[PDB]
Amino acid sequence: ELTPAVTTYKLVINGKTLKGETTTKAVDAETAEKAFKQYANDNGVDGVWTYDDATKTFTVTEMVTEVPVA
């Protein structure tokens, strides 16, 4: 391999208003994670994440910010 070997990673977004899937190509999982976290935040989705190295898939589940209701 003379050239950088890139892998395709997937992101599943389970958000309040953003939903779906996207992909990115990166040299490693760490790079893909950084790209995905940046994308999610830029799009107003912040939450809890999972990653499966077997499927090269990250999932973000958005955490809702609610106010009290007495």
From Swiss-Prot:
It is found in: Secreted, Cell wall. It comes from the Bacteria. The chain holds residues 291 to 357 of 448 of the full protein. It comes from Streptococcus sp. group G. This is Immunoglobulin G-binding protein G. Binds to the constant Fc region of IgG with high affinity. Sequence repeats lie at residues 8-62. The gene is spg.
